[PDB]
Design a binder for these strands. Structure first.
Ligand SMILES: C[C@H]1O[C@@H](n2cnc3c(N)ncnc32)[C@H](O)[C@@H]1O
Ligand code: SF4
Lengths: 527, 539
RNA sequence: GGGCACAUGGCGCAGUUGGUAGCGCGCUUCCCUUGCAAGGAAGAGGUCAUCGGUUCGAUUCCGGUUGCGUCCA
């Protein structure tokens, strides 16, 4: 027949590999060749894959033999599987009180697309997954985690992302339902009450190690921050796009830069970690001001956020930019010019700031004018090497990508500690790194809760240092070392009586063995 | 970490007890007696620069130590000198001694036993089972399986002669319980010696299996399981290394070993082993298949006065096929009792003096005109024939070795060699196949496109499609010229074989009073051996 | 049953004595399933089905073996 011999070929491959691996012996010819020698007796197009054979192993043998094919730390060991979901399409808040929507957001509810949420084009993989789930969080989460399971990953720490427009502009009942649904699809609990859902997810297997909620500076007030900390949010993503007030004004942005900075301060003093969006090639900017703002961003001790997202301005049909690009009022950059600009910007990224992404993955056939290729960071790093300078980004110095791309191993770990001042607070940045090769092995941020901006009833009662983020990628007793040094710092360097770590609800038990007791939404510990 | 020893090893080793007392947590001690790498960090690298001069090169880039090195370092490693073993043994001495340390710091001792390169897991599992508990012992087994591979530790548990520990470990090995539970049950419900035999079988320890199966029965009648086992595995050496006590059973092993040796390859072993068992006809067969005429025929004449000459016929056939005309003549004259045939073999083996002896012995001087003079004439003929043939071969060899004639230069000139024409350096890809090939090498070839080892020292060959060229890079037939000596040896072997024969035959023929041709052929032989280009310029 | 064109990355192909490493899919990796796509980039998978003598050269020449169309008497 056509395909039956393929199924029985996979079956014999599975049984033979299990038998060989029980006593500790490897294969010889990368089973696909052995697969064909039996299944392609007539050569009827039977093409297996690694996922195909993985979905054949029996459960008892699957759960024990699967990770013996993957070894990248963040891939299967650290296992922070970024599982992105989307909310129902809706119109972003500012449109009401200004008159029109942001002038560069493609898609939405009233664009040429009837189906994609705001700032989305309904062609990214996430959009098709959302629509094939009809924007329901339960199906989204279950399907994504199941697809990840099928592809042979041993995922154990799901990290949620809530993409799409401003999620914070929805009726409170709807958001409560969304978050409860996410946690339920993770843990398996089938309840409806946010408190119970959190309490169940905390014990859950497949821990919800956090959740990110991209939002707007205005919709991040005290009450909104309390809401998102109730949900379990751990990292915020804030739209900025410009430090020049004129650009924000001309883009129908609807929020002043001063508002952005105030929101940064109060959120970082609420224990969050903020990742900001920074659009180059905004109208009326030019290369000189582009470089100026990106050089000030890390120089002004007011923004200095921990993450970043460089999103070069892409014009797409239907936006407010098509009725301005067609008239020729605005012309984009040049390919070489923009690659060089990205190179110079990345040259200035301090070691603590992590570059989470570069230019959007909106498809080439749809963009009217902007970035040509889709591998901008590749060319940026090549041009960086050409110029001589090098990148200090966390993502460009973490162990995991090095072991598979650079194929360089770490052997000179040493303790390094930065100590800067951002958003009115004193932020320490501990790390275990490789000074000779500039490889970051583990990191931990830390902040002295500033009197001016802190507001949480847990923090204003007594002096407090917040462990805003702890991350270990590639014996291996590092989290312990970093946590101990942070304790020492908060006891002597900071003079704080109670040190508390914000944590995703999934990982709240890990700090339990460290002696932390659960206070509100934080894992705290007195000193 | 390891530093703490490599810096002041003498003082450290002195105060290891103080150090252990200092380190409070068991965890630190544990994970310090595991990361002991056999490399130093104070005299091979990370030099203390406090005392070095400020103008010295502080440090160069350490080399990557290309993979191949590790191959002849792990096999060159000496497990008696390594620092790891020394510190492990010191720790073991300071820990096993005090009862309190054994009570508490057990996991340290387990780590030490599993860390030393000889991997003393036997002592580790022994001490683990020796604990009188069911809570800590299982914890330590789990710790060991996390540390050391579960399969090897389970095999060591078997080798420790315990099943309960083996079953406890086998719950961490992921093997199907159907594949070991019946095994462990069968091991459990048997006698100590049967269980030990089965244990030593499963690990493959055949010698232990036999040396523990032999002791199951104290009877003088040997078992048949033992002989079946040794026959299946061919370990009779341990059979005779174990039963040096019981003569009768040792003779049983002699019998089975003799059968084995007679079957597989070799024969005098079978005869000398049958010497104890007697095995008359088989002993005779082994002796005569060994071409040992005298011993077999002595056994015949001392045992069988009926087949004395038939074995003599077999031996004379062997010696005629062996072309050993000396013992052939001996057994012909003494046993076959034929002086004429004995002298014929004497002439065949280029012997005349004893041939004259034998002709005199039968009071027969006619034999000279019958065989001896014809035999000497044939000897003269064959020496003349070999003279001419070897002279022609020498001419051909010299003609090939006329001169360098350039041609091949890419090979180091030891490839030429040939009476030290020129020295050489290293070696290049083996070229110049049969009879002066060229080395255009425009392309890589049909069997080409890869690297070439560069092995033209003097000569070489490759297995790529199995040679298929008669010139297997060797100095023989259709030789490729260019041979550093070893072509003289092709002639030296023959002339040294014939030279005692040459002088013997010429002296014997001189004794017969035809010394003209004798001295003629002697002088011709000395001339042809002299004029040979022996090595370089006859030096 | 023997002659017999052919038998060559998993697959259909360029295997060539003036003269042997790759085409199309297929698989693995990263960019990226908007941290891991079944696109694009970049690689791993082989010196012919064995051997004998000569050529810068050898299942590549000749010789026979196991199948793939095929007989023939
Ligand atoms: C999702 C992030 O991308 C920004 N953004 C909005 N429109 C575009 C576009 N056309 N291309 C790239 N990024 C865009 C949003 O303003 C936010 O900063
Ligand atoms: S600019 Fe901000 S608020 Fe406006 S559509 Fe884009 S994401 Fe929504």
């Amino acid at each position: 027949p056509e395909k039956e011999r393929f199924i029985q070929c996979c079956a014999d491959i599975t049984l033979e590999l299990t038998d060989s691996l029980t006593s500790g012996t490897t294969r010889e010819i990368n089973l696909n060749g052995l697969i064909t020698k039996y299944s392609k007796k007539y050569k009827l197009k039977q093409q297996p894959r690694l996922t195909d054979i993985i979905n054949s192993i029996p459960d008892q043998y699957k759960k024990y033999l699967l990770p013996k094919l993957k070894a990248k730390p963040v891939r299967t060991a650290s296992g922070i599987a970024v599982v992105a979901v989307m909310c129902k399409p809706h119109r972003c808040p500012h449109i009401a009180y200004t008159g029109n929507i942001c002038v560069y957001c493609p898609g939405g509810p009233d664009s040429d697309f009837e189906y994609s949420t705001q700032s989305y084009t309904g062609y990214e993989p996430t959009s098709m997954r959302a629509i094939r789930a009809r924007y329901d969080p339960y199906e989204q989460a279950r399907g994504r985690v199941e697809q990840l399971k099928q592809l042979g990953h041993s995922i154990d720490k799901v990290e949620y992302v809530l993409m799409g427009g401003t999620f914070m502009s929805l009726p409170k009942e709807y958001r409560e339902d969304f978050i409860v649904k996410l946690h339920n699809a993770l843990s398996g609990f089938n309840g409806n009450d946010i408190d119970e859902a959190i309490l169940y997810s905390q014990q859950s297997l497949t821990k919800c190690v956090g959740i990110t909620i991209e939002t707007r500076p205005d919709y991040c007030t005290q009450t909104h921050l309390d809401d998102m900390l109730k949900y379990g949010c751990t990292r915020l993503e804030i739209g900025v796009q410009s430090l020049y007030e004129d650009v924000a004004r001309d883009t129908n942005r609807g929020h002043t830069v001063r508002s952005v900075c105030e929101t940064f301060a109060v959120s970082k003093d609420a224990g969050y970690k903020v990742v900001s969006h920074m659009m180059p090639d905004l109208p009326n900017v030019g290369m000189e001001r582009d470089i100026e703002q990106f050089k000030e961003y890390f120089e002004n001790p007011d923004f200095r956020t921990d993450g970043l997202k460089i999103y070069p301005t892409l014009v797409i049909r239907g936006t407010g930019l098509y009725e301005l690009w067609k008239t020729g009022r605005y012309k984009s950059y040049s390919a070489n010019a923009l690659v060089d600009l990205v190179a110079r910007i990345l040259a200035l990224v301090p070691p603590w700031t992590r570059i989470y992404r570069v230019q959007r993955d909106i498809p080439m056939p749809l963009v009217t004018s902007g970035v040509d290729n889709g591998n901008l960071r590749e060319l940026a790093l090549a041009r960086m090497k050409d110029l001589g300078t090098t990148c200090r980004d966390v993502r460009t110095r973490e162990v995991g990508i090095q072991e598979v791309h650079h194929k360089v191993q770490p052997d000179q770990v040493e303790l390094i500690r930065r100590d800067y001042y951002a958003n009115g607070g004193w932020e320490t940045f501990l790390s275990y790194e490789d000074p000779k090769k500039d490889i970051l092995i583990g990191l931990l941020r830390l902040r002295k809760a500033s009197k001016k901006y802190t507001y949480r009833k847990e923090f204003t009662s007594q002096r407090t240092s917040i462990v805003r983020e702890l991350h270990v990628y590639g014996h291996q007793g590092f989290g312990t070392l970093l946590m101990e040094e942070a304790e020492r710092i908060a006891k002597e360097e900071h003079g704080s009586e109670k040190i508390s770590v914000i944590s995703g609800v999934g990982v709240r038990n890990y700090y339990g063995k460290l002696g932390y007791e659960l206070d509100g939404p934080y894992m705290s510990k007195r000193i | 970490l390891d530093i703490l020893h490599d810096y002041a090893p003498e003082l450290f080793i002195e105060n290891l007890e103080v150090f252990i007392n200092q380190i409070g947590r068991v965890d630190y001690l544990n994970l310090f007696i595991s990361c002991l790498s056999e490399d130093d960090v104070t005299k091979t690298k990370y030099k203390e620069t406090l005392y070095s001069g400020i103008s010295k090169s502080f440090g160069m880039e350490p080399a990557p130590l290309t993979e191949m090195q590790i191959y002849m370092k792990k096999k060159m490693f000496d497990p008696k000198t390594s620092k790891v073993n020394k510190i492990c043994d010191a720790v073991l001495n300071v820990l096993l001694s005090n009862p309190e340390y054994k009570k508490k710091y057990l996991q340290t001792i387990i780590t030490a036993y599993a860390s030393q390169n000889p991997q003393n897991l036997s002592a580790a599992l022994k001490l683990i089972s020796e604990l009188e508990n069911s809570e800590e012992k299982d914890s330590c087994v789990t710790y060991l399986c996390f540390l050391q591979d579960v399969n090897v530790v389970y095999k060591s548990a078997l080798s420790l002669y315990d099943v309960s520990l083996a079953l406890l470990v086998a719950q961490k090995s992921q093997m199907d319980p159907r594949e070991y539970l019946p095994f462990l049950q069968e091991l459990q419900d048997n006698e100590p010696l049967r269980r030990k035999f089965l244990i030593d079988d499963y690990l493959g320890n055949y010698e232990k299996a036999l040396e523990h199966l032999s002791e199951i029965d104290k009877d003088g009648n040997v078992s048949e399981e033992v002989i079946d086992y040794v026959e299946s595995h061919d370990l009779y050496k341990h059979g005779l290394a174990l039963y040096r006590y019981d003569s009768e059973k040792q003779n049983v092993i002699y019998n089975i070993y003799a059968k084995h040796l007679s079957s597989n390859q070799m024969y005098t072993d079978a005869a000398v082993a049958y010497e104890m068992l007697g095995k008359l006809k088989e002993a005779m067969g082994a002796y005569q298949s060994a071409k040992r005429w005298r011993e077999a025929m002595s056994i015949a004449v001392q045992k069988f006065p009926e087949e004395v000459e038939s074995v003599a016929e077999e031996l004379i056939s062997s010696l005629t096929f062996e072309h050993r005309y000396v013992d052939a003549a001996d057994i012909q004259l003494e046993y076959l009792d034929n002086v004429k045939e004995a002298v014929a073999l004497y002439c065949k083996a280029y012997r005349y003096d004893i041939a004259s002896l034998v002709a005199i012995k039968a009071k027969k001087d006619e034999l000279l005109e019958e065989v001896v003079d014809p035999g000497l004439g044939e000897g003269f003929g064959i020496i003349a024939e070999l003279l001419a043939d070897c002279k022609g071969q020498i001419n051909s060899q010299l003609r090939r070795l006329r001169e360098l004639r350039a041609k091949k230069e890419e090979n180091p000139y030891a490839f030429y060699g040939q009476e030290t024409e020129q020295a050489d350096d290293v070696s290049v890809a083996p070229s110049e196949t049969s009879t002066q090939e060229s080395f255009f090498t425009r392309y890589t070839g049909k069997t080409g496109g890869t690297a070439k080892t560069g092995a033209s020292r003097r000569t070489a060959k490759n297995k790529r499609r199995e040679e298929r060229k008669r010139a297997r890079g060797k100095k023989g037939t259709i030789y490729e010229e260019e041979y550093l000596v070893q072509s003289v040896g092709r002639l030296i072997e023959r002339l040294n074989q014939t030279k005692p024969d040459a002088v013997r035959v010429v002296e014997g023929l001189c004794r017969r009073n035809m010394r003209e041709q004798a001295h003629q052929i002697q002088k011709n032989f000395v001339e042809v051996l002299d004029l040979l280009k022996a090595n370089v310029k006859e030096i």
